[PDB]
């Protein structure tokens, strides 16, 4: 698994299993990181493209501002959001 | 070929798509407004044009819709 | 005289006399289409109010769609530039 | 000296002394035009976080470059 | 130390240690400048969801790169240790 966080050009933060072939990024199990509360901030993962059943999503790398590896806290929740556990 | 395009402007559009050259031609295009009930409304209400062309650089993702979305789109 | 509607990348809808030479669009008598309600009515207002320029040039990369307007919209546009 | 108004791709309207060398625009004395509600325009410094005299933007980040109405040049001139 | 302020294409203003190799900008210790309310500024970490020390952005996503006023560097420096 290559789990990374993409800041999109639309402003959102996406988290998923990423592979970069050609000039395209293929994303599996993609979630948007929605923060919220002036008290502590709880991060919420929700499915990025709720209007589709597609397993893989392709975006051109031009539509991504940064690709970044998540804090351990965030990978654990992502993992428990997508798979079966220890 | 009914697909859902997330535009660079943030919107989600649904329509009959064909990709020739580096352009996408869209027939019968609707914007998906959520509020959950999803509502389809005509994308470009200011025009009678049957086909609309966008450069693919202005689309973030092209994705195939869930069955209930297709049914509603069809019924429109 | 070619009147079309351009959806800009900034979100706005512009209407004007359009000519496409090189990879640039030249626009004459350009108006923004502002809609509103409280029957949804459309209002045309000058696109670039800070200038007297008769022609404005935009790279076509900043336009999402170029589309021919409904008859009602042309009539109002025609009446607005008179 | 060449005072023009640039609509940026971020939405803003900037006014400044513009020179176009290479595919880059260099701006001196740059102000953002903020309107508010007979509409009143206010010029405020574009980049308040810097003392730089010249600022460079790639022309792909500019939607239009346009010459200002006389009333706007006068105010700009008096702002400097 | 090359501390600069980048206005991104998404609207934000970032401050950090910048190096430009290839057509990419590498940023170390990056903070967003949030203003509020006298002009009043807060520096907060730009990418809070990551531990990465370096962040790479294509220069096409940056509108302007600009050197900060002295008081902004001093805060940035005191915010970085």
Task: Describe this entry's structure for a reader.
It is classed as unknown function. The entry lists the keywords metagenomics, structural genomics, joint center for structural genomics, jcsg, protein structure initiative, PSI-2, unknown function. The assembly is pentameric. The entry is titled "crystal structure of a protein structurally similar to SM/LSM-like RNA-binding proteins (jcvi_PEP_1096686650277) from uncultured marine organism at 2.60 a resolution". Chains A, B, C, D, E: uncharacterized protein. 5 copies of one chain form a homopentamer. By secondary structure, the first copy, chain A, is mainly beta. The first copy, chain A, has one domain: SH3 type barrels. The first copy, chain A, has 1 helix and 6 strands; from the N terminus they run ββββββα. In chain A, strands 1, 2, 3, 4, 5 and 6 form a 6-stranded antiparallel beta sheet that branches. In chain A, a hairpin with a 4-residue loop joins strand 1 and strand 2. The two termini of chain A are 17 Å apart. At the D-E interface, strand 5 of D face strand 6 of E.
What characteristic shape of chain A results from the CA principal axes? globular
- Count of domains of chain A: 1
Strand elements of chain A, count: 6
- What oligomeric state do these chains adopt? homopentamer
Secondary-structure class of chain A: mainly beta
H-E order of chain A: EEEEEEH
Would you state the CATH class of chain A? Answer: Mainly Beta
Distance between the termini of chain A: 17 Å
PDB class: unknown function
Keywords: metagenomics, structural genomics, joint center for structural genomics, jcsg, protein structure initiative, PSI-2, unknown function
Assembly: pentameric
Entry title: crystal structure of a protein structurally similar to SM/LSM-like RNA-binding proteins (jcvi_PEP_1096686650277) from uncultured marine organism at 2.60 a resolution
């Amino acid at each position: 698994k290559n789990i990374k966080i993409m800041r999109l050009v639309t402003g959102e933060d996406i988290i998923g299993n990423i592979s970069e072939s050609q000039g395209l990024i293929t994303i599996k199990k993609a979630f948007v990181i929605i923060p919220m509360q002036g008290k502590p901030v709880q991060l919420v993962l929700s499915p990025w493209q709720p209007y589709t059943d597609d397993k893989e999503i392709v975006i051109d790398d031009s539509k991504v501002i940064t690709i970044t590896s998540p804090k351990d806290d965030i990978i654990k929740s992502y993992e428990s959001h997508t798979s079966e556990i220890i």
